[PDB]
Design a binder for these strands. Structure first.
Ligand SMILES: Cc1cn([C@H]2C[C@H](O)[C@@H](COP(=O)(O)OP(=O)(O)OP(=O)(O)O)O2)c(=O)[nH]c1=O
Ligand SMILES: [Ca+2]
Ligand SMILES: [Ca+2]
Ligand SMILES: [Ca+2]
Ligand SMILES: [Ca+2]
Ligand SMILES: [Ca+2]
Ligand SMILES: [Ca+2]
Ligand code: NA
Ligand code: NA
Length: 902
DNA sequence: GCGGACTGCTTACC
C-alpha cells in the first residue's frame, strides 16, 4: 500500500511526523524541512512559477523554517508581498504526499478514554488537579480492548476490587449491566496507590500512543486533569510524556475567577467528541451530558445511582467503575452510528491537514486550494489584513399569515455552490465589472444584458467563461461526493418506508433478516420477500435501514456544510481568498435567481390554470418556493380522486412532467441573460402537502418568515407510510421549549392540519386539565447561560438581567455555602422554572443545570412553588395563540347565542 | 399601573 501520515508538528526548525510506512508499521521521522517561499520577479526572468494572476515569481529555498519566517517579516517591512504557503506543516504534507491519500483506518490508533476524580470540594478543577484520579478506562482501537485502571486505595476511601461477574449481571440482579459484547474485551488492573496507577498509565500510553484522541469533554476535563495531576506529582518533565515528542503547550484562558487551561499535546490529534457532535450532528440539545446524548442517540437507559457522585466510589465502587467503562463505550456506540471520526479522517486526508483542523473549514479550504494550485505550478497569494464589512445575503419573501390547504415546494440543488460553478466565480477568474441596474430590473428582465463576452452576476462582476477556476473546480469535486452519499441516504429512506409498510402485515414465522445493501433501492425480488417476513426480521431491518440512512446523512450533510462554508469563507477576513466582490456575486445572483423564478412560475401557472393575476408562490427563502396548489386541484375537482394517495400521485406527476420543465426553461433563459458558463440551476420538487382526503384538516399554515407547518405526504421521491409533519421555526422545534410542551404543541398542530378545529379543542381542553401532573423536568424551559457574572451584583440581578440569569442567581442563593451541591457552569444550559409570588426563594424564577435533577436540598421546595399557570400561559398558550390566529382558528370554543340553550 | 419602541439574548432557518 501507499504510505500515509498520522500527525505532523512543527518544532523550531524541525518537523515531527508520525506515519504509517509502505509495510504498515507506525514510525516517527524528524525532518529539517527546507521550505520554499516566493517573490515577484521581472517578466524577463524566466521561471516556472506564477501567481494566480499570472505574474512571474522566483522560488526561494530556505536553510530552515525560522529563516523563512524572518524573511516574511522582512518583506513586510519593505512593503513587498511574500507569496507561498506560510503554514509549513501543510507544505510538508503537500510535498511528502504528492498524491491522493488512500489510508487504512485499522492502522490508525484511535483512543477513547474517560477518567474519574472523587471530590468533596465540588467539581475538581483540572488546573488545580488537587484530587486523586481514582479510575481510568482507556479504549484502544488497535487492540480493541478496554483498559481499566482502578484505584483501590485513596485518602477518600479504600475499596475492594471490581467484579466483572457482577458488572455483567442485570441491574435487576444487583448487577451493573455492562454490555456483554465488551465483557471479554475488558482488561482490568487494580492499583495499591495513585503513583503506581499514573506511572503504569504513562508506560501504557507510550506503548500504545494514540494518534486520534477522543472521548466526552476530554479536551476540557480529562486531558488537562491527567496532565496537571501528573505534573503536580511527578513534575512537568514526566507530565510531558503524554506527548510523543515530549512537547506540550499550556494556553491560558483563566476566565475571570478560577483558571482554565488549554493543554496541547504535540504529536497527537485531539478530537473531543462533544466538539465533533456540536459541529456535525446538526442538532441543538437542551443538555450535553453524555447521559442525555446517549439516551437521545442510542435510546438507552440513564445510568442510575442513588447518592451524589462525590460519594459513589465509597458507597458503590463496583458500580463506579462499571459506569466509567460504560461511558467510554457509549461514545464508541454513538460514533458507530454517527461516524464523525470516519468523516474527520476523510476530510483530513482529502485536504492534507492535521486531522484536528477539520473543525476549521478555512484551514481545510486553504489546504485544498493550495494543493490544487501547487499541481499547476502556481503560487498562492499572501494573507492580507482586512477590515470587517457588513454585506447582505439571501432574500426572504414576507408571507401572508394564513392557512394553506394544498402546497407544493421546490428547491435548488446545492444553491450557492451551483452559483459558483455556473458563474465560474473564483479569485483568478475575475474579468472585470459593469454598471449595474437596480436588482429588480434584472429580475424583471427589463435591464440590458450585462455582457456578451463574460459570465456575469447582477452585483456587477464579470468572470471568464473559458478559464477554469480553482474554486469552481475544487467545490465541484466535493459536491460530487455529496451527491453520491445523499443518493445512498435517500435510498435507505425509501427502503425505510418499504419496511414500515411491510410492518402492517407481519408474517408469523421464524426467519432471519435478509442480506441486502440498504444504500441501494430494493429489487423486486427483495420487495416480494419483505411482505413475507416476521416482525423479528422486519424491525431488525428497519434498524439497519435507518443506521444506513444516518451514516449517509453524516456523509452528505457535512460535505454540504464544507462547500457552503467555502462561500462563507469568501466573506471572512481571515481567508486567504477573502473577496466581497465574489461573496456578493454569489448572494446577489442568488437573490435574482429566486425572485426571477418566482415570476416565471407565476406566469406558467396563471395561464395553464386559467385565472391570470393570482399569486401562486406564497413563500420563499433563499432558494425555495412554496406553491399554492389549490387551483391546480380545483381544475380537476377533488371528487375525481380515489384516496389521498391518488392526488398526491397526481401532483407528483404534475410537478415532475409539467412544472419542472417550465422551471428549467426559466433558468435556461436566465443563464443566457447573464451569459453564464454553465446552466446549473436545478430546481427539483421538494414536498407535497395537504390534508388527508375528505377530512377537516387545514393542511398547512404560515405565521410569518421562517415559521410554518405542513402535513407532508411525499418528500423528494420518498412516499411516507404515514403523513409526516413538516414544522419549521415553530416552538416545537426549539430546544428552549420544554419537552412536554413540544409534544403538546405538536399534537395540537397535527390535529390542526389533519383533523380540524374540533379535534384541536378536544385535545386542548384535556391538556389544560392534566397539565399540572407533568414531571417538572418535562415542563421546564431551557436556555444557555452566558455572562452570569456580568449580571451578578452582590448575589442579586444587576440592571437588564435576563430572565434565566435571574433564575441562576436565585439558585446560587438557595444553595449558598453548601458544597457538593451542583454549580451552574458559565456557558452551559440550564432548566428554568417560574415561581409563584411569596415563595421562599424571593424571586420570579429559578434555574439549575440542564440534564440534571435539581438538588434535593431545595427540590421539594421548588416543586411546591412552581407557577403552573405562568408556565401554561408563556410556554404553551401564547405560542398556540400564534398558530391558531394565523390559520384563523380557535383552540377554545367561542361564546355564541346558542349557549343560551341546554 | 401599563402598552409601545428599543435593546440584549437566545435560537431558529437559509
Ligand atoms: C444551510 C445553509 C445554507 N446556506 C446557504 C447556501 C445554500 O446553497 C443556500 C441553501 O441551502 P439549502 O437550500 O438549505 O441546502 P443547499 O441548497 O445548500 O443544498 P441542498 O438544498 O441540495 O440540500 O443557503 C449557507 O450558507 N449555510 C448553511 O448552513
Ligand atoms: Ca464519570
Ligand atoms: Ca434493565
Ligand atoms: Ca504496590
Ligand atoms: Ca436547496
Ligand atoms: Ca432550502
Ligand atoms: Ca429538474
Ligand atoms: Na471543548
Ligand atoms: Na406481510
Amino acid at each position: 500500500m501507499k504510505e500515509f501520515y498520522l500527525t505532523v508538528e512543527q518544532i523550531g526548525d524541525s518537523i515531527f511526523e508520525r506515519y504509517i510506512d509502505s509495510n504498515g508499521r507506525e514510525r516517527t521521522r524528524e525532518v529539517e524541512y527546507k521550505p520554499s517561499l516566493f517573490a515577484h520577479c521581472p517578466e524577463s526572468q524566466a521561471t516556472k512559477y506564477f501567481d494566480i494572476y499570472g505574474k512571474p515569481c522566483t522560488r526561494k529555498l530556505f536553510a530552515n523554517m525560522r529563516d523563512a519566517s524572518q524573511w516574511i517579516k522582512r518583506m513586510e517591512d519593505i512593503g513587498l508581498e511574500a507569496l507561498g504557503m506560510d503554514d509549513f506543516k501543510l507544505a510538508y504534507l503537500s510535498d511528502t504526499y504528492n498524491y491522493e491519500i488512500k489510508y487504512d483506518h485499522t492502522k490508525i490508533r484511535v483512543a477513547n478514554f474517560d477518567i474519574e476524580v472523587t471530590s468533596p470540594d465540588g467539581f475538581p478543577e483540572p488546573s488545580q488537579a488537587k484530587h486523586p484520579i481514582d479510575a481510568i478506562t482507556h479504549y484502544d482501537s488497535i487492540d480493541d480492548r478496554f483498559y481499566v485502571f482502578d484505584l483501590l486505595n485513596s485518602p477518600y476511601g479504600n475499596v475492594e476490587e471490581w467484579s466483572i461477574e457482577i458488572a455483567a449481571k442485570l441491574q435487576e440482579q444487583g448487577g451493573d449491566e455492562v454490555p456483554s459484547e465488551i465483557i471479554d474485551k475488558i482488561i482490568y488492573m487494580p492499583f495499591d496507590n495513585e503513583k503506581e496507577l499514573l506511572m503504569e498509565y504513562l508506560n501504557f500510553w507510550q506503548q500504545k500512543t494514540p494518534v486520534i484522541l477522543t472521548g466526552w469533554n476530554v479536551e476540557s476535563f480529562a486531558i488537562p486533569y491527567v496532565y496537571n495531576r501528573i505534573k503536580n506529582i511527578f513534575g512537568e518533565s514526566t507530565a510531558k510524556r503524554l506527548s510523543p515528542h515530549r512537547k506540550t503547550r499550556v494556553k491560558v484562558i483563566e476566565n475571570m475567577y478560577g483558571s482554565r487551561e488549554i493543554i496541547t499535546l504535540f504529536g497527537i490529534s485531539v478530537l473531543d467528541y462533544i466538539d465533533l457532535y456540536k459541529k456535525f450532528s446538526f442538532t441543538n440539545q437542551p443538555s450535553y451530558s453524555l447521559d442525555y446524548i446517549s439516551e437521545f442517540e442510542l435510546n438507552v437507559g440513564k445510568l442510575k445511582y442513588d447518592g451524589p457522585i462525590s460519594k459513589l466510589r465509597e458507597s458503590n465502587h463496583q458500580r463506579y467503575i462499571s459506569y466509567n467503562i460504560i461511558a467510554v463505550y457509549r461514545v464508541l456506540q454513538i460514533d458507530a452510528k454517527r461516524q464523525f471520526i470516519n468523516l474527520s479522517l476523510d476530510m483530513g486526508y482529502y485536504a492534507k491537514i492535521q486531522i484536528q483542523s477539520v473543525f476549521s473549514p478555512i484551514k481545510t479550504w486553504d489546504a485544498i486550494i493550495f494543493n490544487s494550485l501547487k499541481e499547476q505550478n502556481k503560487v498562492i497569494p499572501q494573507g492580507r489584513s482586512h477590515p470587517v464589512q457588513p454585506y447582505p445575503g439571501a432574500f426572504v419573501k414576507e408571507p401572508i399569515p394564513n392557512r394553506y390547504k394544498y402546497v407544493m415546494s421546490f428547491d435548488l440543488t446545492s444553491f450557492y455552490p451551483s452559483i459558483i460553478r455556473q458563474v465560474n466565480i473564483s479569485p483568478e477568474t475575475i474579468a472585470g465589472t459593469f454598471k449595474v441596474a437596480p436588482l429588480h430590473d434584472y429580475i424583471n428582465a427589463v435591464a440590458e444584458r450585462p455582457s456578451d463576452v463574460y459570465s456575469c452576476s447582477p452585483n456587477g462582476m464579470m468572470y471568464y467563461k473559458d478559464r477554469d477556476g480553482v474554486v469552481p473546480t475544487e467545490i465541484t469535486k466535493v459536491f460530487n461526493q455529496r451527491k453520491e452519499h445523499k443518493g445512498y441516504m435517500l435510498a435507505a429512506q425509501r427502503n425505510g418506508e418499504i419496511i414500515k409498510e411491510a410492518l402492517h402485515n407481519p408474517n408469523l414465522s421464524v426467519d432471519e433478516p435478509l442480506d441486502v445493501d440498504y444504500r441501494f433501492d430494493f429489487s423486486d425480488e427483495i420487495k416480494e420477500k419483505i411482505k413475507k417476513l416476521s416482525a423479528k426480521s422486519l424491525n431488525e431491518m428497519l434498524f439497519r435501514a435507518q443506521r444506513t440512512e444516518v451514516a449517509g446523512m453524516t456523509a452528505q450533510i457535512n460535505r454540504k456544510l464544507l462547500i457552503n462554508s467555502l462561500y462563507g469563507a469568501l466573506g471572512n477576513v481571515w481567508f486567504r481568498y477573502y473577496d466581497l466582490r465574489n461573496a456578493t456575486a454569489i448572494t446577489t445572483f442568488g437573490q435574482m435567481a429566486l425572485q426571477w423564478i418566482e415570476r416565471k412560475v407565476n406566469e406558467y401557472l396563471n395561464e395553464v390554470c386559467g385565472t391570470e393575476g393570482e399569486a401562486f408562490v406564497l413563500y420563499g427563502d433563499t432558494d425555495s418556493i412554496y406553491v399554492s396548489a389549490d387551483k391546480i386541484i380545483d381544475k380537476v375537482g377533488e371528487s375525481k380522486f380515489r384516496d389521498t394517495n391518488h392526488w398526491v400521485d397526481f401532483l407528483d406527476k404534475f410537478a415532475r412532467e409539467r412544472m419542472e420543465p417550465a422551471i428549467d426553461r426559466g433558468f435556461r433563459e436566465m443563464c443566457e441573460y447573464m451569459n453564464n458558463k454553465q446552466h446549473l440551476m436545478f430546481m427539483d420538487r421538494e414536498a407535497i402537502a395537504g390534508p388527508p382526503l375528505g377530512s377537516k384538516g387545514i393542511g398547512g399554515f404560515w405565521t410569518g418568515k421562517k415559521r410554518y407547518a405542513l402535513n407532508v405526504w411525499d418528500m423528494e421521491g420518498t412516499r411516507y407510510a404515514e403523513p409526516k409533519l413538516k414544522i419549521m421555526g415553530l416552538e416545537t422545534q426549539k430546544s428552549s421549549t420544554p419537552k412536554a410542551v413540544q409534544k403538546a404543541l405538536k399534537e395540537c398542530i397535527r390535529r390542526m392540519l389533519q383533523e380540524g378545529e374540533e379535534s384541536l379543542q378536544e385535545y386542548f381542553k384535556e391538556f389544560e386539565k392534566e397539565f399540572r401532573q407533568l414531571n417538572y423536568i418535562s415542563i421546564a424551559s431551557v436556555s444557555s447561560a452566558n455572562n452570569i457574572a456580568k449580571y451578578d451584583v452582590g448575589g442579586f440581578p444587576g440592571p437588564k438581567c435576563p430572565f434565566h440569569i435571574r433564575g441562576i442567581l436565585t439558585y446560587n442563593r438557595a444553595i449558598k455555602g453548601n458544597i457538593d451541591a451542583p454549580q451552574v457552569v458559565e456557558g452551559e444550559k440550564v432548566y428554568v422554572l417560574p415561581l409563584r409570588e411569596g415563595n421562599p426563594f424571593g424571586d420570579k424564577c429559578i434555574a439549575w443545570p440542564s440534564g440534571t435533577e435539581i438538588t434535593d436540598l431545595i427540590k421539594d421546595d421548588v416543586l411546591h412553588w412552581m407557577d403552573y399557570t405562568v408556565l401554561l400561559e408563556k410556554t404553551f398558550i401564547k405560542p398556540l395563540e400564534g398558530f391558531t390566529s394565523a390559520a384563523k382558528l380557535d383552540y377554545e370554543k367561542k361564546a355564541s347565542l346558542f349557549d343560551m340553550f341546554d
